[PDB]
Amino acid sequence: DAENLYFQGNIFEMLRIDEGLRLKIYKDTEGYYTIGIGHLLTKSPSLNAAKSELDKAIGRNTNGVITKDEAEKLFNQDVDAAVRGILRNAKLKPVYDSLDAVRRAALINMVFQMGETGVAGFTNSLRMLQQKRWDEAAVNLAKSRWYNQTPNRAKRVITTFRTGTWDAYAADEVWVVGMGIVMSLIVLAIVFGNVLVITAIAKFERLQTVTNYFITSLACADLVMGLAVVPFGAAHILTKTWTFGNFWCEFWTSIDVLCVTASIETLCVIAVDRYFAITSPFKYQSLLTKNKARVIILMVWIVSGLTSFLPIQMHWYRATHQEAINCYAEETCCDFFTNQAYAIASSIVSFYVPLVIMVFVYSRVFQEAKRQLQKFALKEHKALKTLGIIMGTFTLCWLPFFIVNIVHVIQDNLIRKEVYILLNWIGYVNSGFNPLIYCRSPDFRIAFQELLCL
Numbered sequence: 001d002a003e004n005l006y007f008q009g010n011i012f013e014m015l016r017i018d019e020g021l022r023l024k025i026y027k028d029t030e031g032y033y034t035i036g037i038g039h040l041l042t043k044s045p046s047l048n049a050a051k052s053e054l055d056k057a058i059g060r061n062t063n064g065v066i067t068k069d070e071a072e073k074l075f076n077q078d079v080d081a082a083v084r085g086i087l088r089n090a091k092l093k094p095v096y097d098s099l100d101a102v103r104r105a106a107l108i109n110m111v112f113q114m115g116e117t118g119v120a121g122f123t124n125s126l127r128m129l130q131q132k133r134w135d136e137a138a139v140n141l142a143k144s145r146w147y148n149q150t151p152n153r154a155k156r157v158i159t160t161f162r163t164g165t166w167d168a169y170a171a172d173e174v175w176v177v178g179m180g181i182v183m184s185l186i187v188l189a190i191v192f193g194n195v196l197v198i199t200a201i202a203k204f205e206r207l208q209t210v211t212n213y214f215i216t217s218l219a220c221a222d223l224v225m226g227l228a229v230v231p232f233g234a235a236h237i238l239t240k241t242w243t244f245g246n247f248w249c250e251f252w253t254s255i256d257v258l259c260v261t262a263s264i265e266t267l268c269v270i271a272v273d274r275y276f277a278i279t280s281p282f283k284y285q286s287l288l289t290k291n292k293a294r295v296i297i298l299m300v301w302i303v304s305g306l307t308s309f310l311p312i313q314m315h316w317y318r319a320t321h322q323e324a325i326n327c328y329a330e331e332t333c334c335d336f337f338t339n340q341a342y343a344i345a346s347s348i349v350s351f352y353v354p355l356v357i358m359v360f361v362y363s364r365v366f367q368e369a370k371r372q373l374q375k376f377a378l379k380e381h382k383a384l385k386t387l388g389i390i391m392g393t394f395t396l397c398w399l400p401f402f403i404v405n406i407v408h409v410i411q412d413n414l415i416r417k418e419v420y421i422l423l424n425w426i427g428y429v430n431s432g433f434n435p436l437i438y439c440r441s442p443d444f445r446i447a448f449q450e451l452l453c454l
């Protein structure tokens, strides 16, 4: 023994990958009511008959939602019952003994999914596993109803039978560290880029313009993202729990919506800022004093503070369904749950109103370029590429999420929790992309050359 590295070999972690943990009742690949980790509730297609078995099997009014603790005890019970069924069965007991440790897990995996009676129906394939003809059972098993309905899970178990090693599952652990190091690169980039931008404008006078004051506020929201929002989210995803208590969960949630609102609402202010600085340059310097700009900065952060901390820290943002109420009470749960009122209103204030303003002025910036005092030249495709990046980056980063942010409260269980988080992270990396977009000026280019080399 003495094995406490990552990914020990066991049926527990093998099934945890094929089934996945779900606290609310869901329909499996076939359409059967399932909860927890691959726990078949009932074959009756009425959701109320599923809750009845669940409430009896938990000994509580679950409302169709269990806790992470209860799921782990149904998982072991279902696992500990699959093995009992293997030993009580005449076709399974000899094959189970004849099997080695890793291939025993493959047999338990099938019994976990189809019961003692069902797995004992593979008379020929069990006869092949009896005589240790692995490659021949791998071919035979791949011709069955079981392989047709869940080919991915079958191919993994069939491979576990064939090779006798965890190769079909051990590859899952490379994707954990690969995600982890990518998260680190993201945190480093965001903190590196934006601390450089804030420093360049704070120490240099050639960069203390009005447009750069908005750049400074954008870099401030993006800095807090890499320092506060992203690291805690990385620790959340990797540890698979939340270890900082219930108050800091919402505070982290509050600082998230604070920065993402301030970040996008500042990109909106910059888009309009440059529209005036380009189309009406002389009034743009008469009207927009450095104080008027600072007041516009405060409006973004007051609007953002009101759309993030006020609702959240007052529990207005909260949902009401069962999985939500459990997560608000579970100290180790910090999953995101809202109501329709908040999930909609925030997307308008955070993304959609800024998006529309931005699509308007940038397109108008170019429509007004045509009606000037003047030939298919080359500086117009250069400028058309530039704003394409300004608009293509911001869109591909946040538009997928805020669409999904609206859908996941319109028709529930249409957007997988997994995807809602990925598209949210695809939005977080916009805070790293921003210094590479709005700081390409010769003044900035020099500031960044002197701040690093000299």
Ligand SMILES: CN[C@@H]1CCc2c(ccc(O)c2O)[C@H]1O
Residues within 6 Å of the ligand: 253, 256, 257, 260, 261, 336, 343, 346, 347, 350, 405, 424
């Ligand atoms: C936890 N991630 C949050 C979830 C929803 C959300 C985000 C950012 C701005 C919003 O206005 C939101 O409604 C995301 O960063």
Ligand code: NA
Residues within 6 Å of the ligand: 246, 249, 327, 328, 329, 330, 331, 332, 333, 334
């Ligand atoms: Na909580």
